[PDB]
Write a protein that binds this DNA or RNA. Structure first.
Lengths: 226, 111
RNA sequence: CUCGA
DNA sequence: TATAATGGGAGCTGTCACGGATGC
DNA sequence: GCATCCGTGAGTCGAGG
């Protein structure tokens, strides 16, 4: 496989004769494809948090949980989601959607969740007071494809509802593997804190899993069909 | 075919760890590292090549290698692991030599 | 290789 | 015993009759 | 059933070097 070019097929999967293995490789035979020296190891770390979100009561759609991509509400007019705490802003943008954290001193004082269709009006490190707009939700707003809502708690107050969402998702981290290193973990395996992913000649260059997550192998040096 | 840097390093690593594994198996079993090495090598190569090794105190025949292989296979999982390590070690050894047969020619043509 | 019979 | 080294290199050919696998 | 490639014989003794 050419440099920086990823595989179209996955490790361990059956192959048919003539079936392309990659944009520049056609397998002459049928069998099991195997990864030869994955140069990039992507780890999807599992994160389970609890975040909040205030919405107009009319726009909201009542559900006990929310699947990815599923509509969370529909606004007739632009709505301003406001801070209910004072503090400094830690803006953590995902692929789509974001987690906005408010903290005073070291301690986090608030954690809001911005679904898709909700443009954040603050930058990282910004100081906010209560009632200050943190994000503008325009039109329809939905769950991002990468995050799912396990449980939903709703608190009716005035003409608004406050949602405590028990969210679960994954965050990717890439690791560039060097030729003198060897991956000691298979595809789709679950790792914890302290577990080694890629070994090396010297201990300081090893790849140890920070938190809990799953392992994905990309960009193999070559592919061995057997 | 000629090895890439990665393939080369991989094979060398497998060989080294394989030898270390034979050492560990000698520690556990209380057997002779040489005998164990010869049994592993015998299984990797096959029934075609089973001859008596000069240093071995015991004549290496399929019977004895089967007895020793059964003494090895009868180990706990974490102990039986080193056996697999050793086997893959020998395999890597064969492949490493065979991959590096050209260099020998390129040198020998000058003598 | 060359010479001899 | 540790930079890396990875497929050789000879090669003029002016006879003849048979048994042979062969192999056209 | 008939051309083609291969292996094998091809005088004696004697002398020199």
């Amino acid at each position: 496989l050419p440099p920086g070019v990823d595989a179209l097929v996955k490790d361990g999967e059956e192959v048919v004769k003539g079936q392309e293995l990659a944009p520049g490789v056609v397998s002459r035979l049928d069998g099991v494809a195997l990864y030869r020296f994955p140069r990039r190891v992507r780890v999807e770390y599992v994160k389970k948090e609890r975040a909040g979100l205030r919405l107009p009561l009319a726009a909201w759609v009542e559900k006990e949980a929310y699947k990815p991509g599923e509509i969370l509400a529909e606004l007739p007019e632009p709505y301003l989601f406001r801070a209910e705490e004072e503090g400094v802003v830690e803006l953590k943008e995902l692929e789509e959607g974001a987690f906005l954290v408010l903290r005073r001193e070291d301690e986090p004082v608030a954690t809001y969740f911005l679904p898709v269709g909700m443009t954040p009006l603050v930058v990282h490190g910004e100081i906010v007071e209560k009632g200050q707009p943190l994000a503008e939700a325009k039109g329809l707003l939905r769950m991002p494809r990468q995050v799912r809502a396990a449980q939903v708690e709703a608190e009716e107050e005035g003409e608004t509802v406050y949602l405590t969402l028990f969210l679960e998702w994954t965050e990717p981290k890439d690791y560039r593997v060097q030729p003198h290193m060897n991956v000691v973990v298979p595809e789709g395996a679950r790792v914890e804190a302290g577990d080694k992913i890629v070994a090396a000649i010297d201990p300081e260059e090893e790849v140890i899993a920070e938190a809990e997550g799953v392992v994905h192998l990309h960009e193999p040096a070559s592919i061995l069909v057997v | 075919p000629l090895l890439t840097l990665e393939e080369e390093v991989e094979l060398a690593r497998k060989v080294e760890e394989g030898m270390e594994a034979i050492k560990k198996l000698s520690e556990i079993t209380g057997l002779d590292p040489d005998l164990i090495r010869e049994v592993v090598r015998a299984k990797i190569l096959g029934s075609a090549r089973v001859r008596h090794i000069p240093g071995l105190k015991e004549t290496l025949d399929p019977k004895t290698v089967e007895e020793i292989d059964q003494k090895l296979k009868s180990l706990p999982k974490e102990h039986k692991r080193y056996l697999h390590i050793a086997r893959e070690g020998e395999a890597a050894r064969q492949h490493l030599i065979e991959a590096n047969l050209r260099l020998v020619v390129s040198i020998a043509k000058k003598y």
